[PDB]
Design an enzyme around this catalytic site. Structure first.
Site, PDB file in Angstrom:
ATOM      1  N   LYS B  45     -30.521 -22.720  -3.052  1.00  0.00           N
ATOM      2  CA  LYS B  45     -29.416 -23.492  -2.492  1.00  0.00           C
ATOM      3  C   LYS B  45     -29.735 -24.121  -0.978  1.00  0.00           C
ATOM      4  O   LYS B  45     -29.311 -25.046  -0.133  1.00  0.00           O
ATOM      5  CB  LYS B  45     -27.968 -22.817  -2.436  1.00  0.00           C
ATOM      6  CG  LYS B  45     -27.274 -22.745  -3.875  1.00  0.00           C
ATOM      7  CD  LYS B  45     -26.003 -21.927  -4.009  1.00  0.00           C
ATOM      8  CE  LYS B  45     -26.224 -20.358  -3.528  1.00  0.00           C
ATOM      9  NZ  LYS B  45     -26.897 -19.681  -4.424  1.00  0.00           N
ATOM     10  N   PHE B  86     -38.706 -12.963   0.604  1.00  0.00           N
ATOM     11  CA  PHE B  86     -39.538 -11.748   0.619  1.00  0.00           C
ATOM     12  C   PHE B  86     -38.704 -10.760   0.077  1.00  0.00           C
ATOM     13  O   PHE B  86     -39.261 -10.126  -1.009  1.00  0.00           O
ATOM     14  CB  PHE B  86     -39.840 -11.357   2.213  1.00  0.00           C
ATOM     15  CG  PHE B  86     -39.966  -9.855   2.471  1.00  0.00           C
ATOM     16  CD1 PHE B  86     -40.657  -9.124   1.719  1.00  0.00           C
ATOM     17  CD2 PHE B  86     -39.015  -9.444   3.597  1.00  0.00           C
ATOM     18  CE1 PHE B  86     -40.583  -7.662   2.236  1.00  0.00           C
ATOM     19  CE2 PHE B  86     -39.030  -7.994   3.753  1.00  0.00           C
ATOM     20  CZ  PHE B  86     -39.829  -7.167   3.221  1.00  0.00           C
ATOM     21  N   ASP B  91     -37.090  -7.432  -4.752  1.00  0.00           N
ATOM     22  CA  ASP B  91     -35.762  -6.956  -5.291  1.00  0.00           C
ATOM     23  C   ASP B  91     -35.919  -7.108  -7.208  1.00  0.00           C
ATOM     24  O   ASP B  91     -35.420  -6.716  -7.723  1.00  0.00           O
ATOM     25  CB  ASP B  91     -34.633  -7.858  -4.770  1.00  0.00           C
ATOM     26  CG  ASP B  91     -33.204  -7.580  -5.409  1.00  0.00           C
ATOM     27  OD1 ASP B  91     -32.708  -6.591  -5.103  1.00  0.00           O
ATOM     28  OD2 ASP B  91     -32.980  -8.230  -6.501  1.00  0.00           O
ATOM     29  N   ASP B  95     -35.384  -4.513  -9.796  1.00  0.00           N
ATOM     30  CA  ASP B  95     -34.262  -4.598 -10.357  1.00  0.00           C
ATOM     31  C   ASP B  95     -34.697  -5.089 -11.825  1.00  0.00           C
ATOM     32  O   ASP B  95     -33.720  -5.134 -12.697  1.00  0.00           O
ATOM     33  CB  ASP B  95     -33.234  -5.562  -9.840  1.00  0.00           C
ATOM     34  CG  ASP B  95     -32.404  -5.253  -8.495  1.00  0.00           C
ATOM     35  OD1 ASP B  95     -32.736  -3.921  -8.205  1.00  0.00           O
ATOM     36  OD2 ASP B  95     -31.942  -5.889  -8.067  1.00  0.00           O
ATOM     37  N   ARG B 100     -35.251 -16.009 -11.915  1.00  0.00           N
ATOM     38  CA  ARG B 100     -34.721 -16.275 -10.423  1.00  0.00           C
ATOM     39  C   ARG B 100     -34.970 -17.820 -10.289  1.00  0.00           C
ATOM     40  O   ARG B 100     -36.079 -18.452 -10.529  1.00  0.00           O
ATOM     41  CB  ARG B 100     -35.674 -15.605  -9.427  1.00  0.00           C
ATOM     42  CG  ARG B 100     -35.570 -15.940  -8.051  1.00  0.00           C
ATOM     43  CD  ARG B 100     -34.375 -15.524  -7.447  1.00  0.00           C
ATOM     44  NE  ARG B 100     -34.080 -14.038  -7.476  1.00  0.00           N
ATOM     45  CZ  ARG B 100     -32.855 -13.274  -7.106  1.00  0.00           C
ATOM     46  NH1 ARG B 100     -31.941 -13.907  -6.683  1.00  0.00           N
ATOM     47  NH2 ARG B 100     -32.973 -12.006  -7.327  1.00  0.00           N
ATOM     48  N   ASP B 162     -28.226   0.605  -2.108  1.00  0.00           N
ATOM     49  CA  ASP B 162     -28.134  -0.056  -3.491  1.00  0.00           C
ATOM     50  C   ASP B 162     -29.073   1.001  -4.566  1.00  0.00           C
ATOM     51  O   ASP B 162     -28.486   1.203  -5.639  1.00  0.00           O
ATOM     52  CB  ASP B 162     -28.844  -1.456  -3.583  1.00  0.00           C
ATOM     53  CG  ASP B 162     -28.759  -2.220  -4.887  1.00  0.00           C
ATOM     54  OD1 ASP B 162     -29.661  -2.074  -5.734  1.00  0.00           O
ATOM     55  OD2 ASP B 162     -27.774  -3.141  -5.110  1.00  0.00           O
ATOM     56  N   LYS B 188     -27.309  -4.746   2.544  1.00  0.00           N
ATOM     57  CA  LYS B 188     -28.195  -5.487   1.929  1.00  0.00           C
ATOM     58  C   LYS B 188     -27.995  -6.928   1.726  1.00  0.00           C
ATOM     59  O   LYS B 188     -28.792  -7.524   1.775  1.00  0.00           O
ATOM     60  CB  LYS B 188     -28.110  -4.655   0.379  1.00  0.00           C
ATOM     61  CG  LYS B 188     -26.801  -5.599  -0.468  1.00  0.00           C
ATOM     62  CD  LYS B 188     -27.384  -5.229  -1.881  1.00  0.00           C
ATOM     63  CE  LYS B 188     -26.118  -5.614  -2.802  1.00  0.00           C
ATOM     64  NZ  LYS B 188     -26.713  -5.641  -4.287  1.00  0.00           N
ATOM     65  N   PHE B 227     -19.328 -12.834  -0.339  1.00  0.00           N
ATOM     66  CA  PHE B 227     -20.469 -13.510  -1.066  1.00  0.00           C
ATOM     67  C   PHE B 227     -21.036 -12.599  -1.934  1.00  0.00           C
ATOM     68  O   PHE B 227     -21.647 -13.116  -3.050  1.00  0.00           O
ATOM     69  CB  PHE B 227     -21.399 -13.980   0.014  1.00  0.00           C
ATOM     70  CG  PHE B 227     -22.515 -14.830  -0.577  1.00  0.00           C
ATOM     71  CD1 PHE B 227     -22.367 -16.059  -0.744  1.00  0.00           C
ATOM     72  CD2 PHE B 227     -23.861 -14.213  -0.768  1.00  0.00           C
ATOM     73  CE1 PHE B 227     -23.282 -17.016  -1.121  1.00  0.00           C
ATOM     74  CE2 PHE B 227     -24.982 -15.149  -1.296  1.00  0.00           C
ATOM     75  CZ  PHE B 227     -24.541 -16.470  -1.187  1.00  0.00           C
ATOM     76  N   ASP B 231     -21.573 -12.684  -6.237  1.00  0.00           N
ATOM     77  CA  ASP B 231     -22.651 -12.444  -6.622  1.00  0.00           C
ATOM     78  C   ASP B 231     -22.558 -11.499  -8.033  1.00  0.00           C
ATOM     79  O   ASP B 231     -23.399 -11.803  -8.848  1.00  0.00           O
ATOM     80  CB  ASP B 231     -23.893 -12.127  -5.572  1.00  0.00           C
ATOM     81  CG  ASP B 231     -25.370 -11.888  -6.329  1.00  0.00           C
ATOM     82  OD1 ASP B 231     -25.844 -12.887  -6.697  1.00  0.00           O
ATOM     83  OD2 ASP B 231     -25.649 -10.566  -6.596  1.00  0.00           O
ATOM     84  N   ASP B 232     -22.059 -10.429  -7.653  1.00  0.00           N
ATOM     85  CA  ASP B 232     -21.866  -9.498  -8.546  1.00  0.00           C
ATOM     86  C   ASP B 232     -21.117 -10.133  -9.899  1.00  0.00           C
ATOM     87  O   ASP B 232     -21.276  -9.865 -10.839  1.00  0.00           O
ATOM     88  CB  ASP B 232     -21.005  -8.397  -8.007  1.00  0.00           C
ATOM     89  CG  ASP B 232     -21.825  -7.445  -6.942  1.00  0.00           C
ATOM     90  OD1 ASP B 232     -22.832  -7.705  -6.926  1.00  0.00           O
ATOM     91  OD2 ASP B 232     -21.180  -6.628  -6.445  1.00  0.00           O
TER      92      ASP B 232
END
Ligand SMILES: O=P(O)(O)C(O)(Cc1cccnc1)P(=O)(O)O
Ligand SMILES: O=P(O)(O)C(O)(Cc1cccnc1)P(=O)(O)O
Ligand SMILES: C=C(C)CCOP(=O)(O)OP(=O)(O)O
Ligand SMILES: C=C(C)CCOP(=O)(O)OP(=O)(O)O
Ligand SMILES: [Mg+2]
Ligand SMILES: [Mg+2]
Ligand SMILES: [Mg+2]
Ligand SMILES: [Mg+2]
Ligand SMILES: [Mg+2]
Ligand SMILES: [Mg+2]
Lengths: 341, 341
Positions: B45, B86, B91, B95, B100, B162, B188, B227, B231-232
């Site tokens: 975005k 980065f 991540d 994860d 992505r 996390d 994070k 935010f 996202d979660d």
């Protein structure tokens, strides 16, 4: 001088950990940072950190070597040791290594795995934390930040060159040239391992001149090329109980100094043996490549290179050391000459 | 204002790539850097990069917005986009993510794999290269270097929190509290995604005051917490064709806002269902956890939180925006409110 200063330098690690692990919410993360620091910054030769300490003592007038000045010097030495720790933790993941400095690689540890990626970045973050804590009010503060940042970029470009020339599953014998080898090694090792510790001590001593840094660089990048050649030799022909790490260059299809020399001396029949057995995980194929190296007398070819290159570095010290005391370059050179660990 | 400035901001990426990809020996590495930049800095975005551009226009007097000044502003915006790139590249590895921004994760690409680790560090290195190239002669140069360095450390400590709360193979339901959640998310995400772009524009506009930065931080860290909650929510209840990424929080045993609220409302019988099915790769177990969330009316609980939190952020803007124009915070807030991508 390195051997004497070693116990003094290691004794300062406790303070480094204390200052970096000093908000209750981040308690578990700070506890993990201590575990990362203790596992990954300890166990090596400390050649880079000690080079900063020994070079600062030799470049600064003794009457200007106060307790705060000396603390900043070994803190900056420990910053170079953290940069080393950052690159090694990530390099062992990417090279699929087993051991480092006599213990299993941090990423191979049960409960760590790919979390080691973030741990490696934390080690890098601690450099700038220590530079801010101890050197923020100093005139060389910005010069050190930019020197650690540029040395990281140069190493990362070298690491890109190392990984691009070593594709898993592809024969890349064509690209294993002397010209490509010199470029990988100059960027991946020579800048951060040799130029960076001396350059940091030079800036801390107020020697910030472009010409002086260029003269020191001419010596130190050659010393670096030589050091990586020894590291490549040790990957296959070194004792893992002494070196502390298991070799992976043949399995990893690496553009090693050994494979570059093998290709320069191999017969068309020997070239095919190398083509068919290099860059593969099979133990019998790795054993075949080693047999070829021993057959082409590569361990003796390394002994002669080590002799000739050391004399060249000595000629470079004689030409470019001035106005710096030659002992600055000679100390590090004798510390790495005839290396076995 | 974001929607208008988007095409203008993306048009500057070509120059960013050109300046970063400008020594023939490192040709292959620089070519790989271009591939890394094009794949990983494009497709999002651009909220962080645009926040720098929009906030700099609103904080600097128009007569002081010269062509060189505006170029520095969108360069710094692109530096925040590289910091994002980065952290995302690393991540997704940690994860074990699949997609992505509407395409397969860079590390999942054939021929990339764990080499993505060094690629991620290269993205981070490009930030300081651009700051040196365009902002080295500016009075805020050091303030921006330290702000990008501290924002990286804070994110990495958050990433440690996390990963420590989300061990693979272990039930960590006990540690999935509101207090632990707020601490993870603050470090994070909230610092680099919300505080960093506004703080950079503030320094570029000469607003370097401690009190002003603390007031802006009070708003922006709350905006950041909100935010990450969105996202979660999107990880499980968002459309992957719109969000561009496949969710992994349940499989990854993550301390998600959803699991924190589930635990606060679940009956002892429902707690057992969660205990037995959370943090595991089995599709039938993930489906079971989602069914429990929908049963406890968690999507409606998110709608109410989003309403209440947005009003609180609005109260914080009213209290702490001055002397900055409230539009600086309102623009970003309206850009993220009722988010679906
Ligand atoms: O310790 P290693 O793995 O032998 C090595 O020297 C490590 C290293 C990491 C980063 C830069 N330079 C060397 P490598 O190049 O992989 O042979
Ligand atoms: O895009 P993602 O993976 O949903 C995420 O937001 C990425 C991210 C990376 C680094 C810091 N903050 C968030 P995560 O926390 O893993 O849910
Ligand atoms: C850059 C290279 C060749 C990696 C290893 O360096 P060292 O051989 O100095 O390893 P440590 O002493 O730090 O363990
Ligand atoms: C810090 C977080 C929550 C990661 C994703 O942020 P975005 O949702 O802004 O992703 P992009 O637009 O950059 O793709
Ligand atoms: Mg390597
Ligand atoms: Mg290696
Ligand atoms: Mg090696
Ligand atoms: Mg994550
Ligand atoms: Mg993730
Ligand atoms: Mg997420």
């Amino acid at each position: 001088v390195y051997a004497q200063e070693k116990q003094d330098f290691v004794q300062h690690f406790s303070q480094i950990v204390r200052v970096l692990t000093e908000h209750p919410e981040i308690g578990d993360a700070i506890a993990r940072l201590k575990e990362v620091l203790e596992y990954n910054a300890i166990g090596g030769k400390y050649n880079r950190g000690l080079t900063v300490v020994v070079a600062f003592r030799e470049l600064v007038e003794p009457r200007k070597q106060d307790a705060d000045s000396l603390q900043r010097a070994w803190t900056v030495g420990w910053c170079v040791e953290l940069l080393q720790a950052f690159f090694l933790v990530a390099d062992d993941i990417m090279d699929s290594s087993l051991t480092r400095r006599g213990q299993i690689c941090w990423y191979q540890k049960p409960g760590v795995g790919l979390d080691a990626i973030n741990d490696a970045n934390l080690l890098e973050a601690c450099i700038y934390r220590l530079l801010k804590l101890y050197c923020r009010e100093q005139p060389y503060y910005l010069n050190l930040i930019e020197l650690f940042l540029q040395s990281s970029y140069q190493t990362e470009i070298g690491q890109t060159l190392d990984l691009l020339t070593a594709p898993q599953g592809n024969v890349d014998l064509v690209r294993f040239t002397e010209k490509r080898y010199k470029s990988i090694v100059k960027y991946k090792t020579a800048f951060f391992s040799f130029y960076l510790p001396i350059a940091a001590a030079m800036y801390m001593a107020g020697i910030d001149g472009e010409k002086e840094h260029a003269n020191a660089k001419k010596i130190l990048l050659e010393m670096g090329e030589f050091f990586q050649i020894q590291d490549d030799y040790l990957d296959l022909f070194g004792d893992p109980s002494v070196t502390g790490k298991i070799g992976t260059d043949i399995q990893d299809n690496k553009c090693s100094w050994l494979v570059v020399q093998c290709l320069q001396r191999a017969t068309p029949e020997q070239y095919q043996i190398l083509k068919e057995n290099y860059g593969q995980k099979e133990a019998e194929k790795v054993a075949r490549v080693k047999a070829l190296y021993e057959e082409l007398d590569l361990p003796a070819v390394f002994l002669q290179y080590e002799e000739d290159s050391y004399s060249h570095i000595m000629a470079l010290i004689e030409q470019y050391a001035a106005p710096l005391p030659p002992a600055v370059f000679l100390g590090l050179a004798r510390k790495i000459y005839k290396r076995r660990k």
